Design a protein around this ligand. Structure first.
Ligand code: ANP
Ligand code: ZN
Length: 422
């Protein structure tokens, strides 16, 4: 079995990762056939973090690109497509400075074109792209696009699909198949995959990624309290105000000190109140909304919640040792976590402590996002799983992106399968 390869660089807001995928040459159009071969994490920040030094964006990719030359057999380099796709970090930089954004894309382009792979371009994905391609990855890997049954006895209704919730560093996406009528063309997606029509809803909330939410809570805590009720008692840090208010996500909060001391107080109730200010539920120009006046039909079906949903839930279960099987359990785990002092929290984590002071805020954010924002309840929440991998492949938008650009999912089966699915 001759294999083929393809490569995607996911240039996210906080990190770039490289995925190399492989599949058999003569089975390439079967669903679920493509899988991850290897991956590489680029050291340092995302490409948008090089906005004032765009040369370093391209250079940052070199070590992982050297790994790709070793991971893919040499005689296949020339015919292996290589893509770079960038997400909300670059969408935010594009708001601030389209020129700096262009210089970063130019610097990564120049680096990538020096390599022997068939480089097909560096692009910023839309929020819709990001949501939909994540949904295609999960469902492709789990073989949900197979028509189950056999002639004369097809399963009905057809096999359900897995909704996707992705909590990145600078935006978050929700995407799922729905039977409700569309009310906003911005959210409406129609896919034709293996001869079947999928009616999908998607939305991306810019500035609702983990790192931007933490920045917004920090801005809010500085304004309202001059302490940080989500941070643990005994933790303090010197906050440089310029970093807090430079983001498009926080410049709306700006209130002439350069640096302020800010300490935690382990106040789970005040933390909950701080997080609640993130969601505007005051108006809805549609029949129903999620939040911020965005149309959303009722959630339905199973969901996979990956990226920082998985990392936060993994902290709560594995480090705090708390169950999160229900929304009530998640809320209780968040309360217990938020009420820990800094010495108590550190006692649970013998190794490196990065992100530890932030789990209370992120867990509170996720609980409110699911319950207040998307309107999960106990019944719908029972159908959510927290997982970051399927069939030995990382779940994210990268695979679905590669599948689309490489044209590896047919709209129709060959010969329409003689019309046996009609
Ligand atoms: N191994 C890990 N453990 C705990 N947290 C992590 C880990 N890796 C990443 N994170 C955090 O989780 C958040 C989302 O990470 P990731 O999904 O890599 O976002 P991204 O692709 O960089 N951002 P975006 O461009 O908005 O999709 C970031 O705030 C990360 O710092
Ligand atoms: Zn991402």
């Amino acid at each position: 079995p001759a294999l083929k390869y393809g490569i995607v660089l996911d240039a996210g807001s906080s990190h770039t990762s490289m995925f190399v995928y492989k599949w058999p040459a003569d089975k390439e159009n079967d669903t679920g056939i493509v899988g991850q071969h290897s991956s590489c994490d680029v050291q340092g920040g995302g490409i948008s973090s090089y906005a004032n030094d765009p040369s370093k964006a391209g250079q940052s990719l070199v070590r992982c690109l050297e790994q790709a030359l070793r991971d893919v057999p040499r005689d296949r380099h020339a015919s292996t497509p290589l893509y770079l796709g960038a997400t909300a970090g670059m969408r935010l930089l594009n708001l601030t400075s389209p020129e700096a954004t262009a210089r970063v894309l130019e610097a990564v382009t120049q680096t990538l074109t020096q390599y022997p792979f068939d480089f097909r371009g560096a692009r910023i994905l839309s929020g819709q792209d990001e949501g939909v391609f994540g949904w295609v990855t999960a469902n492709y890997l789990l073989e949900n696009f197979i028509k189950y049954g056999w002639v004369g006895r097809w399963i009905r209704p057809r096999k359900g699909t897995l909704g996707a919730m992705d909590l990145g560093g600078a935006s978050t996406q929700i995407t799922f198949e729905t039977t409700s009528p569309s009310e906003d063309p911005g959210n409406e997606v129609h896919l034709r995959l293996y001869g079947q029509h999928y009616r999908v809803y998607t939305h991306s909330f810019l500035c609702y990624g983990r790192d931007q939410i933490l920045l917004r809570l920090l801005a809010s805590a500085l304004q309202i309290h001059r302490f940080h009720p989500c941070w643990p008692k005994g933790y303090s840090t010197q906050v440089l105000l310029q970093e807090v208010y430079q983001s498009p996500c926080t410049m709306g909060q700006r209130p002439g000190s350069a640096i302020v001391s800010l300490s935690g107080t382990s106040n789970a109730t005040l933390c909950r109140d701080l997080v609640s200010r993130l969601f505007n539920i005051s108006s809805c120009p549609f029949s129903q909304c999620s939040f911020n006046g965005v149309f959303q039909p009722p959630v339905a079906g199973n969901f996979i919640a990956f990226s920082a949903f998985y990392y936060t839930v993994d902290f709560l279960t594995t480090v705090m040792g708390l169950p999160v099987g229900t929304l009530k359990q998640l809320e209780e785990a968040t309360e217990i976590t938020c009420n820990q002092t800094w010495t108590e929290l550190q006692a649970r984590v013998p190794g490196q402590k990065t992100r530890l002071a932030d789990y209370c805020a992120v867990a509170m954010f996720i609980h409110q996002l699911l319950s207040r924002g998307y309107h999960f309840d106990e019944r719908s929440f029972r159908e959510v799983v927290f997982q970051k991998k399927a069939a030995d492949t990382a779940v994210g938008w990268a695979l679905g992106y590669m599948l689309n650009l490489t044209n590896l999912i047919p709209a129709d089966l060959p010969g329409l399968r003689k019309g046996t699915h009609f």
